[PDB]
Design a protein around this ligand. Structure first.
Ligand SMILES: CCCCCCCCCCCCCCCCCC(=O)OC[C@H](COP(=O)([O-])OCC(O)COP(=O)([O-])OC[C@@H](COC(=O)CCCCCCCCCCCCCCCCC)OC(=O)CCCCCCCCCCCCCCCCC)OC(=O)CCCCCCCCCCCCCCCCC
Ligand SMILES: CCCCCCCCCCCCCCCCCC(=O)OC[C@H](COP(=O)([O-])OCC(O)COP(=O)([O-])OC[C@@H](COC(=O)CCCCCCCCCCCCCCCCC)OC(=O)CCCCCCCCCCCCCCCCC)OC(=O)CCCCCCCCCCCCCCCCC
Ligand SMILES: CCCCCCCCCCCCCCCCC[C@@H](O)O[C@H](CO[C@H](O)CCCCCCCCCCCCCCC)COP(=O)(O)OCC[N+](C)(C)C
Ligand SMILES: CCCCCCCCCCCCCCCCC[C@@H](O)O[C@H](CO[C@H](O)CCCCCCCCCCCCCCC)COP(=O)(O)OCC[N+](C)(C)C
Ligand SMILES: CCCCCCCC/C=C\CCCCCCCC(=O)OC[C@H](COP(=O)(O)OCCN)OC(=O)CCCCCCC/C=C\CCCCCCCC
Ligand SMILES: CCCCCCCCCCCC(=O)SCCNC(=O)CCNC(=O)[C@H](O)C(C)(C)COP(=O)(O)O
Ligand SMILES: Nc1ncnc2c1ncn2[C@@H]1O[C@H](COP(=O)(O)OP(=O)(O)O)[C@@H](O)[C@H]1O
Lengths: 98, 459, 49, 104, 88, 55, 347, 320, 54
């Protein structure tokens, strides 16, 4: 693999670690989710362009579309959480235990 | 052998379609008729079994057990209708349904030709018994007893299932006839040792073996009278029947794998006989008596000789009848005085003479007086053990003394002495209880008259 | 007797009852016809008769 | 209320002899009681017990005990008449048994 | 688990510590039975400030009445114990 | 000594005690996504290093 | 929520599941998962309250993380082999990531923490949907890629799931959490036999779905979410409690009930390979699930708990809404063992 | 067809049936005031359905035959013995109060269901929003414990929040001495023992809690003793009310759908009345519960579902 | 004289948030009877702005 591929994999891993380690804000985790999506888009585009897979050129676009849905979904949920607590802190989501 | 299985499945809707005040009469009459029908299985051959079909067969070892089960159902019905008088009709029908389902499962268990089918039925017997114990028991310990009755069984039986399927992936068949004919010796390896343990531990915990018996006092004390009857007289013999069946594939490992269990059986027989000497509960005394007798049966099965197998079969039949009689005799006094303490109601021979005669006969049979079948089984087992090793006559002899002591102890505690002054609610014995005692005791001496019917296939 | 309407009246709902019996009889006759044709096809393929 | 819950009192036990001096201990209704006693006694003692014991006592000899005794009598007579031993230590003819060739 | 079961001795220790942190009370002359106005020479406003300091320390609000009659540390301890239902 | 104490102590009471302790250990979680998402990260790394590296 | 909107959302959930089940393209399977999550999020919040919002947020975070790992595994597989078809998963790292993502979606241990919380935070109908219908798609993918699984990782997660399900369910008085822990243990059982036989996985899933549907419909019929509120049902309708007790016994795996058939079969299958120790440990551990089922049966059916006075009023009314599939579900949950060989129709 | 999501999908909408006379009305007042007569006259003049005040046996009047059952099988409480021994040690007082709240909740559900199904207005005597005053009167006099008040508050909080408050609240003011005079002149020998403190507590609770908090939702029409007999003037006062401030105008079709599914299926209405809080006054032992339930199931028309009891003349059972 | 049945003391073992209470979980509370927590008074402050004089 070239160095660009491993750089994109490193970006994906960094975004995954950022999501998995919450600080306080849900918005930062949502941004990490969008970063994962961006890294996936870039890597899929690079692989498709490198091998001249013509019919797969539409695949990244579809990816972006569903990313938007997830983003919208997340933002919607954030709104409701804020309306319950006046803050988007993840420590307020503790009503349910194991 | 569907001529016996189908009438029980017909007892089910007949009970559920009966008029509200005629359930007991119909159930008892048709259960007695089914016992009369099942009496025909005693006509056995001398070489092989009665192979009715690909699924069911009857042998000289299982026919007396089937007769005992079908005879015990009506006795449970008579013993149960006293304390269930205030119950609603639907719950009475449910209780009778549990009893009928237990009888059906036991009948199918004692005749299954297949070991996995035997496992399925021998495990299905738990649900009606557990429901009976935890629903119609009297005190709050019953719930715990049910748990003790359940997991103690399952922890022993779940490994067996694994072993069973393992065997079927090696020999290709679990049918008992093919297993017997295609038998091969077991080598001496760790895998074979653990396979032996998996095949043995379920039946050893259902006996129960000494050290694994803690569930039995709870189960036999907190259960209703019918539950105690069926637990002591039939459900303990599942372990013996299963061990007699499964030991055909465990040779020659048993030759040295029986030492810990033989030691436990003998020393714990002495220990439980001694425990019977200091017991404030009358039901617990009978339970520990059952433990001692089943320890003797374990020794007989483990030493693997024809005389031992004959004595073991006779001892299982005799113990079933005797322990059921003892439980019913104790339940009469309990229903009179609502307490299980042995030294509460004393001097009952003065107040109930015929009941005292029943007590005397039951206690004389419990201590194996000649020529009762109890003595025949005990003496055959003792002779086999003496052939196994001359020193056993010590321990066995010890037990023979201790049993007698505690047996007469119970009698002398309950029937002799002076009556308790403040207990004035001891009514004359009902015809139902006397008939129950007579129907328990007459078959015992009738079988004494013809002892080869309960001596098993090795006869 | 009932103070309320009790939508299930003394007469049963005849449409539902008729539909139930019709479906049951149709299923039974369909099963019999299917079994007959299966038997005939099996005999024809194996040439018993 | 100084109480913990609303509950019925524990009722006293009913004596079946009060309303039926000859009560048989089967049921509170005298007729059903009497017929329960009658069916129990007839089908337990008369039918199952005595007739079953008679049936068992006269079961045909499917264990072949008498046949075995007669066969043993025949064999003993023959072997004593012709001087052969009464029994042989081998239950199988050695001619049909093939031992391994080498024991070393 | 939550905070330990606060007792009378800890209450008295905290009350005395807060009182000796007040810059206008000498630590040595202050005792658990010293009257604020007579022994310590404080008028109404210092008593108000002391009550507010107790408010800060124990995290609960004492109205104008109730607090108007806490005249020495022992009464403050008794009031705090009674409000918190502490018997030991 | 034997029937009521030690035979009870070894087989059933020990089993019940162990099961109760493990149940309390397992089910007592605060319900904070931070903690068990950190545990998810640890699990993912352990899975890539233990099982995935050995193929 | 509007009934038309609710029907559209439910149909979109089922359409996402079907798209996962009928596709040969990894992108289409991923799209099915995305659509299923998008339509499922509002269904969990049909009854609006803070607990439902928390459950929806936790579920969304978990499933979005799992889907991102899924897409990354797909992209790695494409990089090392230009294939889009769902097949033997030509790369091992991609297969490890795929297994982790699908386990997170199913709730297998140690990615199990979200299941009890989400089940407790939502209504009984939403919990029914989540614990029955939401297991089909990841299990279908796992069945399709079963030949390339790493048995060590899958079996470790299955054993952990069984152990954690039993231990966690041992400590619950809330019925929804009990159901969630039972679900975790049953997913462990389903995934333990997956590397050896997918037909056994399908059989176990079908029997578990039938039993769970019967249990949840019985819990909806008698409006109980806690043990104590369920202990009142005997004084209102005892038939429901009796059927519930028999269903609990079946769920405990006792013969001759049909809940015994899956484990039995799985054990036999695992004994056709060598695999002796693992089934023995698995049955030993399932005894815990049986224990707390028995405790529920004690609390609700085999003993009578005290009731309240206002219950008398409830005696005068009948159940208005009637579930048409409850009797068939109960009968299939209990009296099905004699029809065991019909499992041949599954393969 | 039974109302449900299917009827809402095609056709049925609640908003169209409302024709300016929906107007849930309650006529509150202290003990022995003429609120009932005013309620009947208002219902007659406006053409609304009048609901008599829910008693101990209200639920009996709507199920099976309308005749009441035995007190042992229904209610298990007495108003007469509450008057005789309000401080009894068997928990009669709070048992009666809880049963009365349950009955009032059922009646409110019935009234809302009728209004939302037919569009016709209803007139109630008291409501779930007014019952609490009696509870308060029981607490100040020492007739019930504080735990009973806590349990009542829990049940009311989980139940009464799901419905809509009445459009217009009519209250009738009668001073306590006049109430005592009316009670003395009545003749019922159990109400002579009502002390003036009890009635004063009821009036205090009314005027200090119910009217202020109810006035925030909608305006309240108060009438003295003399100006309640003229029902025509009261009705003409009701008619010219500007009702645009409560939750009622803020109700759309889907909220009405939810409420209409709630008001039917009375089991869901009564769900939280039997919460597993074990007060000695309302907790019943297993043996007594079993005996009483067996007694109840043996009533002539109670063993089976309404249309399946052949002992009260149900025919064609084997085809239903 | 009659079968034992659970009483209030027996029933109260199953009314907590968890079985086998410990020191940490002794302060967990059971969920509300309906799944509705009471709304917190999380007041949001509006923006205060000076409009004029400049
Ligand atoms: C060898 C004798 C031969 C006798 C021929 C006739 C035999 C008839 C047997 C009848 C069937 C058994 C019935 C038992 C239940 C009791 C029924 C009853 O309530 O009666 C009340 C009735 C009316 O009295 P009541 O005024 O109501 O009194 C009530 C009070 O409670 C007052 O009560 P009580 O104080 O009168 O107490 C009753 C009385 C008697 O009650 C009993 O004890 C009955 C049970 C005896 C013990 C059984 C356990 C031991 C195992 C023996 C197995 C033998 C089975 C043989 C086949 C039997 C088939 C049924 O007590 C005793 O006498 C002592 C009992 C202990 C005897 C010990 C004997 C040791 C063994 C002896 C040899 C046995 C084998 C013989 C063959 C040997 C080789 C040739 O009295 C009688 O009818 C007579 C009592 C029966 C005495 C029989 C004792 C000897 C018989 C031994 C067995 C039968 C052998 C027959 C073949 C020949 C051998
Ligand atoms: C009230 C009870 C209270 C409750 C108590 C509990 C009761 C529970 C009961 C439960 C149910 C039990 C059912 C069991 C069924 C068992 C039936 C059975 O298998 O029968 C077998 C057996 C019949 O054998 P078999 O295999 O059928 O016959 C084969 C041959 O082909 C036949 O040979 P054969 O060709 O020579 O013909 C002989 C034939 C005819 O032979 C003769 O007539 C000749 C007899 C000799 C007399 C010759 C001289 C006398 C007359 C001379 C003067 C007149 C002639 C000239 C006229 C001018 C006058 C000078 O006589 C017979 O067939 C024997 C009688 C049949 C009895 C069957 C028993 C059925 C019992 C079932 C009912 C159970 C309830 C009891 C009710 C029974 C009634 C109370 O019956 C016996 O008991 C035989 C015993 C008699 C032998 C003598 C005794 C020897 C004693 C030696 C031992 C001494 C030691 C001390 C022990 C003392 C103890 C006695
Ligand atoms: C409370 C009551 C419950 C019921 C009790 C059931 C009793 C079960 C006991 C099992 C019987 C024997 C088990 C194994 C057979 C031999 C035991 C061993 O001591 O013998 C020697 C074994 O040697 C050493 O002892 C090695 C084993 C040592 C490790 C075993 C652990 C023992 C600790 C005891 C713990 C208590 C167990 C019960 C727990 C409840 C023989 O030497 P070796 O020839 O090499 O082994 C024979 C097998 N070969 C041929 C394949 C080689
Ligand atoms: C109340 C007061 C009582 C005292 C007074 C009583 C008066 C006298 C009555 C007592 C009789 C004394 C007994 C003397 C022995 C005579 C009977 C004996 O001879 O019969 C035996 C026969 O006994 C029977 O075989 C035994 C009866 C079978 C027992 C079955 C019990 C009924 C089933 C009920 C359910 C079982 C439950 C237990 C499970 C196994 C012979 O055996 P056998 O050597 O062959 O016969 C050879 C000749 N044959 C073959 C041609 C017949
Ligand atoms: C490796 C894992 C192996 C898994 C083995 C599972 C063992 C099966 C039994 C599980 C019992 C668990 C009991 C438990 O956890 O709690 C202890 C329990 C708590 O009571 P609760 O009902 O929960 O509380 C109600 C009032 N608050 O305390 C008790 O008293 C339990 C009483 C009944 C238990 C009886 C168990 C008898 C077991 C016999 C031996 C079998 C062990 C099985 C493994 C055998 C070894 C190979
Ligand atoms: C940042 C800096 C901002 C500064 C702003 C300051 C604002 C000033 C506002 C002042 C308002 C008043 O004058 S308020 C008017 C205050 N005057 C009176 O009360 C007259 C009677 N005097 C007394 O009662 C005692 O001398 C008393 C002093 C109370 C002591 O109380 P005690 O002995 O019983 O403890
Ligand atoms: N919630 C309640 N608690 C206790 N008693 C009540 C309650 N509601 C009504 N009552 C009793 O019902 C009786 C009649 O009710 P009321 O409406 O005041 O008189 P009337 O029927 O003449 O209008 C009164 O004795 C009153 O005390």
């Amino acid at each position: 693999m070239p160095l660009v591929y491993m750089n994109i994999i490193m970006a994906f891993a960094i975004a995954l670690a950022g999501l998995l380690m919450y600080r306080s804000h849900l918005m930062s985790s949502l941004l990490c989710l969008e970063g994962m999506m961006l890294s996936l888009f870039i890597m899929s585009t690079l692989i498709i362009l490198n091998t001249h897979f013509t019919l797969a050129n539409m695949m990244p676009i579809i990816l972006l579309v569903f990313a938007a849905c997830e983003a919208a979904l997340g933002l919607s949920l954030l709104v409701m959480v804020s309306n319950t607590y006046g803050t988007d802190y993840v420590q307020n989501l503790n009503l349910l235990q194991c | 052998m569907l001529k016996i299985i189908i009438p029980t499945t017909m007892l089910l809707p007949m009970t559920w379609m009966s008029k509200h005040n005629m359930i007991w009469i119909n159930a008892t009459v048709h259960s007695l008729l089914i016992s009369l029908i099942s009496l025909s299985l005693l006509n056995q051959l001398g070489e092989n079994s009665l192979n009715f079909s690909l699924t069911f067969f009857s042998d000289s070892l299982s026919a007396p057990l089937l007769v005992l089960t079908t005879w015990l159902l009506p006795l449970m019905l008579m013993a149960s209708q006293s304390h269930l008088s205030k119950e609603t009709t639907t719950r009475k029908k449910l209780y009778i349904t549990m009893l009928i389902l237990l009888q059906l499962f036991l009948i199918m268990t004692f005749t299954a030709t297949e070991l996995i089918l035997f496992y399925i039925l021998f495990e299905a017997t738990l649900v009606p018994t557990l429901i009976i114990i935890t629903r119609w028991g009297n005190q709050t310990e019953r719930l715990n007893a049910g748990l003790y009755f359940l997991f103690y069984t399952l922890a022993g039986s779940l490994p067996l299932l694994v072993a069973l399927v393992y065997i079927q992936n090696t020999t290709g068949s679990l049918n008992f006839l093919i297993i017997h004919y295609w038998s091969h010796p077991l080598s001496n390896s760790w895998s074979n040792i653990f396979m032996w343990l998996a095949c043995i531990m379920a039946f050893m915990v259902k006996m129960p073996l000494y050290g694994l018996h803690l569930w039995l006092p709870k189960a036999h004390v907190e259960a209703p009278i019918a539950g105690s009857m069926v637990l002591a007289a039939v459900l303990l013999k599942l372990g013996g029947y299963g061990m007699m069946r499964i030991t055909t594939i465990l040779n020659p490992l048993t030759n040295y794998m029986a030492y810990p269990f033989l030691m436990l059986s003998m020393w714990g027989m002495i220990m439980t006989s001694s425990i019977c000497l200091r017991q404030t509960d009358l039901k617990s005394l009978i339970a520990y008596s059952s433990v001692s007798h089943m320890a003797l049966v374990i020794v007989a099965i483990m030493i693997q000789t024809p005389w031992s197998f004959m004595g073991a079969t006779a001892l299982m039949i005799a113990h079933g009848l005797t322990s059921s009689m003892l439980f019913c005799l104790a339940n009469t006094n309990y229903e009179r005085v609502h307490s299980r303490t042995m030294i509460l109601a004393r001097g009952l021979q003065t107040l109930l003479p015929l009941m005292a005669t029943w007590w005397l006969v039951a206690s004389l049979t419990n201590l194996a007086l000649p020529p009762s079948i109890n003595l025949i089984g005990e003496l055959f087992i003792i002779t086999a053990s003496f052939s196994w090793s001359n020193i056993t006559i010590i321990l066995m002899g010890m037990n023979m003394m201790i049993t007698a002591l505690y047996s007469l102890y119970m009698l002398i505690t309950t029937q002799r002495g002076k009556y308790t002054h403040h207990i004035n609610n001891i009514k004359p014995s009902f015809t139902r209880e006397n008939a129950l005692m007579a129907l328990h005791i007459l078959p015992l001496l009738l079988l004494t008259l013809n002892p080869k019917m309960i001596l098993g296939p090795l006869y | 007797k009932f103070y309320i309407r009790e939508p299930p009246h003394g007469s049963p709902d005849w449409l539902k009852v008729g539909l139930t019996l019709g479906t049951s009889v149709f299923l039974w006759i369909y099963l019999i016809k299917q079994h007959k044709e299966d038997v005939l096809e099996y005999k024809r393929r194996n040439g018993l008769e | 209320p100084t109480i913990r819950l609303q509950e019925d009192p524990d009722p006293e036990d009913e004596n079946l002899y009060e309303k039926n001096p000859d009560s048989h201990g089967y049921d509170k209704d005298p007729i059903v009681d009497l017929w329960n006693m009658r069916v129990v006694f007839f089908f337990g003692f008369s039918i199952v017990l005595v007739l079953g014991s008679t049936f068992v006592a006269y079961l045909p000899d499917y264990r072949m005990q008498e046949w075995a005794r007669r066969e043993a009598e025949r064999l003993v007579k023959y072997r004593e008449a012709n001087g052969l031993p009464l029994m042989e230590s081998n239950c199988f003819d050695p001619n049909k048994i093939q031992l391994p060739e080498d024991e070393d | 688990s939550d905070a330990p079961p606060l007792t009378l001795e800890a209450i008295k220790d905290r009350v005395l510590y807060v009182l000796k942190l007040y810059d206008k009370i000498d630590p040595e002359k202050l005792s658990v039975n010293s009257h604020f106005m007579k022994d310590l020479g404080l008028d109404s406003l210092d008593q108000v400030e002391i009550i507010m300091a107790m408010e800060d320390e124990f995290g609960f609000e004492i109205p104008d009445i109730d607090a108007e009659k806490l005249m020495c540390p022992q009464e403050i301890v008794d009031y705090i114990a009674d409000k918190k239902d502490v018997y030991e | 000594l034997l029937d009521l104490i030690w035979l009870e102590t070894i087989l059933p009471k020990t089993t019940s005690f162990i099961q109760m302790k493990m149940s309390i250990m397992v089910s007592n979680q605060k319900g904070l996504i931070k903690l068990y998402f950190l545990s998810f990260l640890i699990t993912i790394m352990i899975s890539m290093t233990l099982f995935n590296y050995h193929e | 929520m509007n009934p038309i909107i609710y029907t559209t959302l439910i149909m979109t959930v089922m359409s996402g599941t079907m798209l996962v089940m009928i596709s040969s393209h990894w992108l289409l399977i991923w799209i099915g998962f995305e659509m299923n999550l998008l339509a499922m999020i509002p269904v969990l919040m049909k009854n609006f309250n803070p607990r439902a919002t928390e459950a929806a947020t936790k579920y969304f975070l978990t499933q979005a993380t799992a889907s991102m790992m899924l897409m990354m595994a797909i992209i790695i597989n494409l990089l090392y082999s230009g294939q889009w078809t769902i097949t033997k998963m030509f790369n091992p790292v991609a297969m490890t990531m795929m297994t982790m993502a699908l386990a997170m979606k199913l709730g297998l241990s140690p990615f199990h923490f979200w299941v009890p919380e989400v089940t407790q935070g939502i209504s009984l109908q939403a919990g029914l949907l989540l614990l029955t219908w939401q297991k089909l798609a990841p299990l279908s993918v796992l069945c399709q890629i079963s030949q390339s699984i790493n048995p060590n990782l899958m079996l470790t997660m299955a054993m952990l799931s069984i152990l954690i399900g039993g231990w966690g369910g041992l400590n619950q008085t809330q019925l929804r959490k009990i159901m969630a822990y039972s679900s975790i243990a049953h997913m462990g059982w389903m995934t333990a036999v997956l590397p050896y036989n997918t037909t056994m996985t399908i059989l176990n899933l079908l029997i578990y779905i039938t039993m769970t549907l019967a249990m949840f419909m019985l819990l909806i019929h008698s409006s109980a979410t806690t043990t104590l509120s369920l202990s009142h049902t005997w004084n209102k309708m005892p038939v429901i409690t009796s059927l519930m007790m028999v269903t609990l016994l079946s769920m405990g795996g006792l013969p001759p009930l049909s809940g015994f058939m899956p484990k039995w079969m799985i054990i036999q299958e695992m004994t056709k390979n060598e695999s002796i120790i693992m089934p023995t440990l698995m049955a030993m551990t399932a005894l815990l699930n049986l224990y707390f089922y028995m405790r529920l049966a004690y609390s609700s059916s085999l003993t009578m708990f005290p009731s309240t006075n206002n219950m008398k009023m409830k005696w005068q009314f009948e159940h208005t809404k009637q579930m048409k599939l409850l009797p068939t579900m109960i009968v299939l949950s209990t009296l099905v063992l004699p029809m065991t060989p019909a499992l041949s129709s599954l393969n | 067809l039974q109302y449900g999501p299917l009827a809402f999908v095609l056709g049925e909408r609640t908003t169209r049936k409302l024709t300016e006379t929906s107007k849930v009305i309650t006529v509150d007042g202290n003990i022995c005031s003429g609120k009932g007569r005013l309620a009947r006259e208002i219902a007659e003049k406006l053409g609304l359905r009048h609901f008599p005040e829910a008693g101990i046996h209200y639920a009996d009047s709507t199920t099976g035959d309308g005749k009441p059952l035995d007190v042992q099988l229904s209610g298990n409480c007495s108003l007469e013995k509450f008057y005789d021994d309000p401080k009894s040690n068997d928990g009669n007082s709070y048992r009666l109060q809880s049963w009365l709240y349950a009955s009032r909740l059922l009646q409110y559900a019935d009234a809302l269901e009728h209004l939302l199904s037919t569009g016709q207005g209803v007139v109630l005597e008291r409501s779930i929003y007014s019952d609490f005053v009696f509870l308060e009167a029981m607490y100040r006099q020492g007739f019930i414990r504080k735990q009973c008040v806590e349990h009542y508050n829990e049940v009311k909080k989980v139940t009464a929040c799901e419905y809509l408050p009445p459009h217009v609240v009519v209250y009738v003011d009668v001073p306590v001495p006049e109430i005592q005079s009316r009670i003395q002149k009545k003749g019922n020998p159990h109400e002579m023992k009502i002390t003036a403190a009890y009635l004063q507590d009821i009036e205090n609770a009314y005027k200090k809690t119910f009217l202020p908090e109810m006035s925030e939702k909608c305006e309240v029409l108060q009438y003295s003793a003399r100006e309640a007999e003229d029902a025509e003037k009261v009705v003409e006062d009701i008619e010219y009310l500007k009702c645009d401030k409560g939750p009622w105008p803020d109700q759309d079709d889907r909220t009405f759908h939810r409420l209409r599914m709630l008001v039917q299926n009375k089991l869901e209405v009564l769900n939280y009345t039997t919460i597993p809080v074990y007060l000695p006054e309302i907790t019943i032992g297993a043996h007594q519960s079993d005996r009483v339930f067996q007694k109840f199931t043996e009533l002539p028309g109670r063993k089976y579902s309404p249309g399946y009891n052949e002992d009260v003349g149900d025919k064609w059972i084997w085809l239903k | 004289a009659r079968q034992w049945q659970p009483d209030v003391e027996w029933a109260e073992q199953f009314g907590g948030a968890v079985m086998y209470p410990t020191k940490e979980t002794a302060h967990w509370k059971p969920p509300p009877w309906n799944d509705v927590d009471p709304p917190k008074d999380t007041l949001v402050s509006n923006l205060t702005l000076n409009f004029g004089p400049q």
